[PDB]
Structure formats: C-alpha cells, structure tokens
Design a protein around this nucleic acid. Structure first.
Lengths: 191, 190
RNA sequence: CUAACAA
RNA sequence: CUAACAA
C-alpha cells in the first residue's frame, strides 16, 4: 500500500476525474481506484474511538441518558461542539457507532444559527433551550450491556470537553483538513 | 476483494492493455491494476508448499550450494527447465520465496537461445557451460536454519526432476493457462 | 473552525 | 512449449 498522504489522495482524485469518463472500458480499474481512494481517505481523516467488548444480551431492556455540560464559560473561545460533531457530523457518527450510543447536543447556543434559537425559546418541544449547552449521551441495550457502552461513550465525550492547547489537536486538524477539501475543491474530491 | 476467477483475470488483462494507449494519464491506476492482477494470479495458480518450521537464528552463518544434474539423457524430450522456471519464472521465484533459497539453472542447454552458448562456451564467467545441465540450489542462513531451508528446496527440485506422464501434469497445465491468460491469447468470458 | 441528531 | 536467477 502506497503511503496515505494528502498529496497522494489529490493524485488519485485527478486520475479518478479522467478515468470515470470511460466507465465501461475501465469498469474494473475504476472500482480498484474507488477502493484505494476510500482507503486513503479513511487513513487520513477518520479518527476512531476504542470499541468495547460486550456480553451477549441478558436481562431487562434499559434506556439511559446522561447529561454533561460543556464548560463553555471556563473556556469561552473554544469551539467544543464543532469538534464533537465534525465535518457533516462525521465525528459524532463515528463515536455513535464505535460506542453504541447516541450523541445529541442541546441547550442554549446549540442551534447552528443562534438567531433562529431566540424564536423557539419557551415554545413547546424546545424546552432544552432554557438549559445551558450540554451533550446528552444515550444508550439503549440490555441490563448487562447498556452501562458498559455508556461508560465507553462518556469517557470519550468527556475527553472531547477538554480543550487541547494550540498545535496539539490531532483530531481537530484532521477535521479541518478534510473540511478544506470539502468546500475548497469541487464535486469529484468532496465526499 | 473481487472473487479470483480466470474470467476476471482475463478482464483485468484486457483493461491493462487498453491502458497502454494513455502513457501518463493513469500512472497510479496502472500500479493498482498490477497489484490486483498479481493478487488474482497468485490466488489461481500458486502452488501450496508445506510451510517449513524454523528455529531462531543460532550459530555461524553458512552459505551452501548444491548441484543437481537433470536426467536430460533418460528423458531427451522433456522440457525440465521450462517446468522448473514457469511462466515469467514465477514458479522458480515462488519456490525461492517459500524456501529462502536461490534457484539457478546452469549447464549446457541452460541458455534460452543455444546459439549464444556457442559464443560464450569456453569464455570466462561461463565455465558452467562446460558442464551438464544442472540446477544450483543455494541457501544462506545460520546453521540451525540453513539446512532446513535447503532440504525444503532440494526436495522440491528433485520432484520437478521426475517427469510426469502425459496429460496428468496439473502443474504444466496451470503454468500454460496462466501464461495464456496473461498474454491474452486465452480470454475466457464465461 | 466543523452542525450531526431530533422535529 | 513456460526462461527466471546472474553480467
């Protein structure tokens, strides 16, 4: 396997732009190239969280939701939500999958556009806007699995609520790098 | 991974040929297509060599080379070399890889074009031509490994030096079928 | 300098 | 009717 660098991915993409013009003549080799582009993307941008080992289901079904406030006040300038979510919410999805939980960002300043927020305030079904910015972590499994999963996701969400000093944020950098590619380049290179 | 069938390998070989028309546009694609051609080639035609077991290196370094003459006299029409080497030398190369040994086919008749042996016979660095066609089998390792390795290769070269009766040579059949698909003379669409 | 989830 | 290794 060729080293996964951004420079390489760019190379593969320019090739993919040309190769896809002849989808029939080159059907097999386009698939091969899609494979390699996919592999290189995963190695570059995808950061993965530890997966935990679970017993087979046994006991009652339990749904459990923990609320963890984001230390927005203590660190007023740090963008915690953006780093938890990731480009297209990819990081949150990765976390959801790896831990078997559901991640939901809620409370004041949780809406993408803070202007629209001020309108829903008080209204029914939006009562969480009265609360401070928090992450809800939620797992539903059987009595002998649900708490294992939860604790796995809690440990990760808590890590992400500790802001990283300048130039040490490996997670953030991968995110921003991918993001630059998404909205700096055209269609054949994003997603 | 796509399933490795001869129909697929053919298809990949077809594409590689079409790619010759774009000299620079698909450098990475050519390399990737080669990797896959190779992977499939191995899946279809690789011989299964018992994986020998190896002690940890202990002892003095030993380089040993054994010479095995091929019974070219007793079997004057049997292509022994062709069967030892294989298509693109891949049979020999794999034996090399599986045993840690080096395989060299030497002697009179050893050169592809015997017209050339004449030109070199008697010359320097070509003194092996004054000898009968034979196979040098060579390994270099520590003492507790080098003889294990060597016996593995020697056993297999010996096997290959016993000709097979007609149309029961599954090795020769796999070899010429790989060779056909890869040169694109055999193009199964099945 | 990320916006998923839910509606 | 397979041609590697070595120069």
């Amino acid at each position: 396997s060729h080293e996964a660098t951004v420079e390489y991915l760019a190379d593969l993409v320019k090739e993919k732009k040309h190769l896809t013009l002849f989808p029939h003549m080159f059907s097999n080799v386009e698939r091969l190239l899609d494979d390699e582009i996919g592999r290189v993307r995963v190695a570059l941008f995808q950061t993965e969280f530890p997966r935990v080992e679970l017993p087979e289901p046994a006991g009652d079904m339990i749904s459990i939701t923990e609320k963890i406030y984001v230390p927005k006040n203590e660190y007023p300038d740090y963008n915690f939500v953006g780093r938890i979510l990731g480009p297209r919410g990819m990081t949150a999805k990765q976390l959801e999958q790896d831990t078997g939980c559901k991640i939901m960002v809620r409370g004041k300043g949780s809406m993408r556009d803070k202007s629209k927020e001020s309108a829903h305030r008080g209204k029914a079904n939006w009562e969480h806007l009265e609360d401070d910015l928090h992450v809800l972590v939620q797992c539903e499994d059987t009595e002998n699995r649900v708490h294992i999963k939860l604790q796995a996701a809690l440990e990760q969400v808590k890590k992400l609520l500790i802001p990283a000093p300048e130039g040490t944020d490996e997670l953030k950098r991968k995110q921003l790098m991918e993001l630059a590619i998404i909205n700096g380049t055209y269609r054949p290179m994003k997603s």
